Amino acid sequence: GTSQWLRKTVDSAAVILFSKTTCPYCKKVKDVLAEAKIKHATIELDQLSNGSAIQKCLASFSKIETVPQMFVRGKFIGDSQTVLKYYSNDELAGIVNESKYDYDLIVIGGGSGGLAAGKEAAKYGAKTAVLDYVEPTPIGTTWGLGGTCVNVGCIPKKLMHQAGLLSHALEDAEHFGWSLDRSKISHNWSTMVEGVQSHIGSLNWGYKVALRDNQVTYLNAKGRLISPHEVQITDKNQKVSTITGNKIILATGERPKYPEIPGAVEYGITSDDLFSLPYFPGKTLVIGASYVALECAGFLASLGGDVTVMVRSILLRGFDQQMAEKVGDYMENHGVKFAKLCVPDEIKQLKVVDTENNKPGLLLVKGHYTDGKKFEEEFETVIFAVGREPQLSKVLCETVGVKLDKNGRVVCTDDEQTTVSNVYAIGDINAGKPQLTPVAIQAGRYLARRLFAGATELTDYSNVATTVFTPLEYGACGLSEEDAIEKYGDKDIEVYHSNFKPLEWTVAHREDNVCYMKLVCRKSDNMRVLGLHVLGPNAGEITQGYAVAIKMGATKADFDRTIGIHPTCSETFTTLHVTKKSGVSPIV
Amino acid sequence: GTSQWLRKTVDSAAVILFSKTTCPYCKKVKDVLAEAKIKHATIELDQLSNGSAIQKCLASFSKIETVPQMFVRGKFIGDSQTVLKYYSNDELAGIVNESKYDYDLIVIGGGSGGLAAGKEAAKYGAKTAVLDYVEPTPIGTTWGLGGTCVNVGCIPKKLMHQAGLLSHALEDAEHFGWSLDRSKISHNWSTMVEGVQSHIGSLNWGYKVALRDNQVTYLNAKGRLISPHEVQITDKNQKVSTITGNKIILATGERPKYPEIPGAVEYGITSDDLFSLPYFPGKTLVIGASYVALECAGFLASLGGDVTVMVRSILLRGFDQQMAEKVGDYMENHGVKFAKLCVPDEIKQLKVVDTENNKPGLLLVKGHYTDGKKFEEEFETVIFAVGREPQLSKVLCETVGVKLDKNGRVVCTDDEQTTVSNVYAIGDINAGKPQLTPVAIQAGRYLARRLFAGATELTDYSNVATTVFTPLEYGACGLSEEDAIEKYGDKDIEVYHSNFKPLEWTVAHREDNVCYMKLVCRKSDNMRVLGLHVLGPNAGEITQGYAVAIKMGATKADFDRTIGIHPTCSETFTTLHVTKKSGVSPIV
Numbered sequence A, B: 001g002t003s004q005w006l007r008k009t010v011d012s013a014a015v016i017l018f019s020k021t022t023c024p025y026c027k028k029v030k031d032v033l034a035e036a037k038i039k040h041a042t043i044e045l046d047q048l049s050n051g052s053a054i055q056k057c058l059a060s061f062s063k064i065e066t067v068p069q070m071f072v073r074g075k076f077i078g079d080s081q082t083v084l085k086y087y088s089n090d091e092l093a094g095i096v097n098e099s100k101y102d103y104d105l106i107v108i109g110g111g112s113g114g115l116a117a118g119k120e121a122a123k124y125g126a127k128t129a130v131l132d133y134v135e136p137t138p139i140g141t142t143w144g145l146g147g148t149c150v151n152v153g154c155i156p157k158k159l160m161h162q163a164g165l166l167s168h169a170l171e172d173a174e175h176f177g178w179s180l181d182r183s184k185i186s187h188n189w190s191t192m193v194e195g196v197q198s199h200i201g202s203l204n205w206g207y208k209v210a211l212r213d214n215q216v217t218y219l220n221a222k223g224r225l226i227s228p229h230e231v232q233i234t235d236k237n238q239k240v241s242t243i244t245g246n247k248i249i250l251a252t253g254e255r256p257k258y259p260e261i262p263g264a265v266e267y268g269i270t271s272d273d274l275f276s277l278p279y280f281p282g283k284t285l286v287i288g289a290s291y292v293a294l295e296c297a298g299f300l301a302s303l304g305g306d307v308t309v310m311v312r313s314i315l316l317r318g319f320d321q322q323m324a325e326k327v328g329d330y331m332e333n334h335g336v337k338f339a340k341l342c343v344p345d346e347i348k349q350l351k352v353v354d355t356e357n358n359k360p361g362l363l364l365v366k367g368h369y370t371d372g373k374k375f376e377e378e379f380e381t382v383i384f385a386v387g388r389e390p391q392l393s394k395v396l397c398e399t400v401g402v403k404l405d406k407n408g409r410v411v412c413t414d415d416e417q418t419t420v421s422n423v424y425a426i427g428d429i430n431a432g433k434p435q436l437t438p439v440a441i442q443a444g445r446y447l448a449r450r451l452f453a454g455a456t457e458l459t460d461y462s463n464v465a466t467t468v469f470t471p472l473e474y475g476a477c478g479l480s481e482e483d484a485i486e487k488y489g490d491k492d493i494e495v496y497h498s499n500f501k502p503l504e505w506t507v508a509h510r511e512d513n514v515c516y517m518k519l520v521c522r523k524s525d526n527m528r529v530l531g532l533h534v535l536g537p538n539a540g541e542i543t544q545g546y547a548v549a550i551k552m553g554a555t556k557a558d559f560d561r562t563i564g565i566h567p568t569c570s571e572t573f574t575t576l577h578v579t580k581k582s583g584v585s586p587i588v
């Protein structure tokens, strides 16, 4: 296995030094390379348990068993005397730059995963290019470098959520003694958008600086993989050229889906448009029941808007359905209207958007309920949040041999390798994986280290915690209650649960017995915690730390023996005692 | 060991049933006892690995080896036929009520620990009395049932902290698009206090109802332990009587210290007075540098007050001093003045408090700095926060034989037992233990289960997480960096750290590179996490979950392999990479 690891590492690293921490010759070479500004990976064999075996195995590549040993792109370059010879003869720069390809790595896609992968690879001397292109939405919306999360996802979404949370902060402040006249307080959408967009702009710019400062080539160009090592690029001017790369990372993400009904593309918008919308949405219909749908509906209602969500069947399919119902119940009790068991048939235009005065248009939405009654109501804005999908036939020619599944996502090994052995895929287009920004980042950074620094660590995609930033937030890590029961059987599952009330809600006169948490546990495995679920404020902060404990195999006894921090919401996880099977009420 | 456990369990339980989950005779007895409203502990031997040994060992108490076996106060009462005989002859109630003592348990002190202990004990049939008396402060302040945290500690402190946090919420709201005129917004102290006190009142009342509903006797009386089983009580009317108890729990807590300087008792106040203060403090001097001092100074300044903290030497002695300095720096940058290296000499009165119009008085504080310069400044309110101390010579006669340490705290075994074998101590008066409400609660609940339900589980007092609710909150779990270095040596310690910026602070134009976190790790123990530290918003929610992982022995690798929740503050713990020894800046 050492041999297989070493051969893969040598074949793939751009520039790599096999070293020992206590060798002056190893240090001679490192100082030369640093002085010449030559970035490289380093493997200190005296820090590896099988370093002595690695050292002997190196002779199969270099005919020598000593350190240091320098490799470039699979070729043994030399020991210390040889490296210094190249340097003193001004030959070293040419040696370390020789490649069959323009780049060691081409990343197609400049989002959460691709930027993380490209930046990390460049640290080890990989000559890296990152391609990013944002295809405009149907109304023409585009944005800068950084991907979905930065421009039209997690970042603006949570900032507008915070704008919404500040509404309840204004309400609460009076009860806590602050003297303010709410009846003169209103929200200005475009002032909020301008602040959000200024921050996004600082991220776009920061990423461009980051890539420059790491000697990564950034091309604002659409990339298309035409053969395993050839990426055809089309720039702003429609100029087409081809660049070649040793390793390719596909990191192209997804875009919103539209339903195939008249008027949807012409008159509706998606989340891609919402976060830079130059007019206030006004009275809004959200069609959809995903976390995007409910998050957007939620903050729009807390900003004072007249909001309706059209739900075909259930909320948050794939999430714990008890929690999903509690999430939606809170929203309905706090101003969000729900058109349940309802689907849209047609969007018709009644007024065009006012580009000069930044006012929405007006739309007539026709639909129908399962009981046969018709839905017909006017809205100023209609947001479709009915799923997202990859768009790879734009990005890889069918002839390259990269296998997709029936949803168009890339079929990968557990080390992100596609069916084309130099081509990898990370982030939302990697089939089967949780579609989250920190997953994409960990996947890309860890992959880059395996490709170019000899690492072995894989990304662990199990028990990845999430938070839905609805008006009352929902954090989760692990299995839903229903999935646990399906997998292990009802008799092997114990669920501990409790309502709770944040201390902050007491003086503010908010609800008893609405915030809620539970631990879904496996009886036959020492009451192992299979799933953790919390509905309450700051739910992402609550949940995150428990994800470490769940990764480590926490049991109910581990939660019990831990002491709470008081007064917090999270501490209630350390004193749960009511089981669902007991039938005792969880209210407090 | 089974024999020692069984003998202790039988001797101590008030009413206990040795049972098997699948015995109809065991169920006959349980239904009788439930019908007769006889509360008891139950031990299901068929759920214990050594139940068959326990079953045989029971014959040494009962001459029989079958289940069920019922015991009362150390006496075998009978099998099923005998218990039913007592019931059918109307003799059972008398049997289960016979005791050498008025109570199975007397709790002296109705605070966090004592209420938790008393309520839990009563669940197992322990006839329980809880005594609580609040000695008035020097200005006459008193309050109701529930202890320090409920009335004059964690609960009002965090509510006033929230009032302070809402100030920054009003500031932020404008940047997020809300239109409000701050120049007409002010804070009303007494409106806030009235809300806080209404909540506290609901807790006082809830505890009284809770005790009634659990058949606990609540005596609003000062208790004094005069012999191992005799508690002398003095009621509101100065009527003195004696009650007897089998087990005694001392749970009497501490009160604020005053320095011995002229005017301190006459003209200053403490936290005991602050949380119900009927006048606004106005321009305030806090003398002290504890978490109480800094928490109180912090919220008073965020409510708009003119606040100074007088610091003799350092902040937060006993806490990580890097974090303490960052905590204080934030406060100084946000309106809190610090009189450093300064001590008070004299408080003189310039105006008496206005009891009719609810306005503060006025005080002249004279003090001196270490460089010899004099301190002389006027304040409307002076708060002493210079430590807390037990007051047990009021509570136990010296002749009883309960050993105290040199600070007046009770010297306990690891199961809370004092040097008097039926007398236990929990909470703040238990020497050496973290002085926190959830510790007191876990200690009392777990002790009650050992005394009256045959449990063996001890309270684990190690790595107890904390949060200081200063304007920028500070959460911690485990060792300070300096304590780790002292214990293991600098060469065995690695510290990973980073600044961060909450997403909520971006649009709000708050500080870069002020929030901060670190993991203090042990190199020779697989990079075990010895201490976790975070300065930032919602720090108690951030910290809590990690305390489970630290309890389980988390390493740096366990943090790394866990995926972040984005966007949160807490996720930065999952991607730390800068070490202090590297010298690389932690800024971001």
Ligand SMILES: Cc1cc2nc3c(=O)[nH]c(=O)nc-3n(C[C@H](O)[C@H](O)[C@H](O)COP(=O)(O)OP(=O)(O)OC[C@H]3O[C@@H](n4cnc5c(N)ncnc54)[C@H](O)[C@@H]3O)c2cc1C
Residues within 6 Å of the ligand: A108, A109, A110, A111, A112, A113, A114, A131, A132, A133, A134, A135, A146, A147, A148, A149, A150, A152, A153, A154, A155, A157, A221, A222, A223, A224, A251, A252, A253, A254, A271, A292, A394, A395, A426, A427, A428, A429, A435, A436, A437, A438, A440, B565, B566, B567
């Ligand atoms: C509204 C919304 C809210 C969200 N909120 C959260 C949240 O709170 N927390 C969380 O963890 N996740 C959240 N997500 C998910 C997160 O945004 C994605 O998981 C993440 O962005 C995926 O990263 P990626 O690198 O796979 O793709 P992306 O970030 O989508 O980046 C892919 C980039 O490649 C570009 N591209 C596509 N094709 C090409 C091509 N041929 N050539 C060049 N460039 C191309 C794309 O235009 C894009 O810029 C949210 C998503 C949405 C839509």
Ligand SMILES: Cc1cc2nc3c(=O)[nH]c(=O)nc-3n(C[C@H](O)[C@H](O)[C@H](O)COP(=O)(O)OP(=O)(O)OC[C@H]3O[C@@H](n4cnc5c(N)ncnc54)[C@H](O)[C@@H]3O)c2cc1C
Residues within 6 Å of the ligand: A565, A566, A567, B108, B109, B110, B111, B112, B113, B114, B131, B132, B133, B134, B135, B146, B147, B148, B149, B150, B152, B153, B154, B155, B157, B221, B222, B223, B224, B251, B252, B253, B254, B271, B292, B394, B395, B426, B427, B428, B429, B435, B436, B437, B438, B440
């Ligand atoms: C300002 C302040 C803020 C705090 N904030 C926090 C925080 O945020 N989180 C946290 O975990 N901890 C906090 N604490 C600590 C917490 O309050 C204590 O750890 C906790 O209250 C100790 O509980 P206890 O049961 O030991 O004693 P107490 O809660 O003090 O209860 C003891 C009771 O016994 C009464 N008593 C005393 N003698 C007698 C007697 N002879 N007879 C009858 N009754 C008697 C006392 O008057 C009191 O009512 C704070 C403390 C203070 C002062």
Ligand SMILES: OCCN1CCN(CCO)CC1
Residues within 6 Å of the ligand: A317, A318, A319, A320, A466, A476, A477, A478, A479, A480, A531
């Ligand atoms: O989109 C469906 C995602 N789904 C929700 C999160 N789940 C994990 C937490 O319970 C798993 C899958």
Ligand SMILES: OCCN1CCN(CCO)CC1
Residues within 6 Å of the ligand: B317, B318, B319, B320, B466, B476, B477, B478, B479, B480, B531
């Ligand atoms: O009052 C001193 C308390 N002190 C602070 C908390 N510490 C633990 C977290 O680092 C331990 C002790």
